[model samples]
Target: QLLTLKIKYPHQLDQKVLEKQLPGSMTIQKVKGLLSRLLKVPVSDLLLSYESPKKPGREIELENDLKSLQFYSVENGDCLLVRW
Candidate 1:
């Protein structure tokens, strides 16, 4: 079974800022940690299944792609529907 998660960041965090604050690059592993911290869930139980139209592809590291693209900006109200 899979679950969908809508992630929204309070402020626009650049790739450099995210990389500096996060454990690793913008990878599924890092996201798992973020989700675990945010939702109080174990990293092992959190999975990165699929990203929505906002972020396509299943690449583990999304920092490069996100930083390179202008549309990848995660605004305050930006929503990310992810399935797990």
Candidate 2:
């Protein structure tokens, strides 16, 4: 299963929002690694969370790095907030 997620990093206005197509089976840890490579940030400094379309105005942090996106109920068009 694939998902198209919007990646938001407000610190970088030039590339604040990046759209990524990733697998639903991918873990948050792997996602952070991917974003680290793409955004040139260290993996350890990245904080990942997501806002689901089903729950507006509420952000759920991806606290469990080993958990899959599907475990967090992340779907297509979700906004994933990344912070350092």
Candidate 3:
């Protein structure tokens, strides 16, 4: 099943900070790690959720089956609070 992620800024901030203050650029894997740290969840439990803006409200397919997926890259004051 496809999950809609409401992007959030905290995750982006964490990623940017890590990239600037640390020695290397952020990778998808690093973003995943940062998310794991922020949400206090295991890395194994997190999955990357994606959608096509071109197809606004259509169902997308997940590459793998999983229990939960979370959205990242949210900006300040934006809201996306549901998960299924």
Candidate 4:
């Protein structure tokens, strides 16, 4: 199943959310490349993190590009925060 992510960038003036569908098998490196295109930012400058439904008040950062999304336990309806 594809995980639906709500990407939020607080630094943006528009404050609009970006919706993306990602596979659990996809690596973090691949996801970063995808987001870099949507946000028009370099992959190196984009910082990725997600809020899991199971964990409140905690945003887990995607630090390992080689790891799959499933390894981070990301799921549908998760909120991903992007920072530069």
Candidate 5:
């Protein structure tokens, strides 16, 4: 399964907004690992969050690295906010 998300890094000197597409079976750790390697942020300081249309004014955290993106409410066109 494949999923695409708009990722934005607040403190990274590289690209501010990124169109990230990956396997939906991948865990948060895996994505973070890729982000750290491909982007300017570190895995230690990477903060991931999402916003759902069902819930407003909420910063949903990707806290469990063992969990897959399919386990969450993420979808294509959804934006993932990454901060350091």
Candidate 6:
């Protein structure tokens, strides 16, 4: 299955949006690596979080690079908050 992520930079004034389609079988580490390469930033400088509209203010900071998307139970149309 495919995991579609809606990416946004929360701390940025411009707040540009990005999208990525990833494999569910891939680990979060790969996701971070992909984001890093695409954004030309180091993974250590990034903080990825999932923002759930249904559960407002509970944006989860995904820190485990070893875990897979299925392990995190990520859903389609999920919005990811990127902070650098």
Highest lDDT scorer: 2
Ranking by lDDT: 2, 4, 6, 5, 1, 3
Q: Compared with the true structure, what per-residue lDDT tens digits does model 1 show for residues 1-84?
A: 122334533233311112112222254555566677876868776533323455553323233322311234332322342223
Per-residue lDDT of 7-80 in model 2, one digit per residue for the tens? 88756653437789999999999999998998799998999888887887688989989999989989999999
Off by over 4 Å in 3: 1-25, 58-84
How well is each residue in 6-70 modelled by candidate 5, as lDDT tens digits?
A: 77664564343778787888898888898888876788877788766567547788889889887
Clashing pairs in 6: none
lDDT of 6 by residue, 1-74 (tens): 79887888878744439878878787877888888898899988877788666786578777888888766777
lDDT of 4 by residue, 1-84 (tens): 699888888677434387888999999889899988977989988888888778865888889989998899889989888888
Candidate 4 TM-score, C-alpha based:
0.85
TM-scores for every candidate against the unseen true structure? 0.36, 0.87, 0.38, 0.85, 0.79, 0.83
Q: How many clashing pairs does model 2 include?
A: 0
Question: How well does candidate 4 score on lDDT at residue 55?
Answer: 88
lDDT of 1 at 70: 20
Per-candidate alpha-carbon RMSD to the true structure: 11.8, 2.1, 10.7, 2.0, 2.9, 1.9
In candidate 5, which residue ranges exceed 4 Å CA deviation? 11-16, 53-57
User: Candidate 3, residues 18-81: lDDT per residue as tens digits?
Assistant: 2112112334355456567776867666655443455444334332332223323322222222
Predicted model with the maximum TM-score: 2
Q: What's the lDDT for candidate 3?
A: 0.37
Minimal lDDT window, size 10, model 2 = 9-18
Model 4, runs deviating above 4 Å: 13-16
Clashing pairs in 2: none
Query: Candidate 5 — which pairs collide?
Result: none
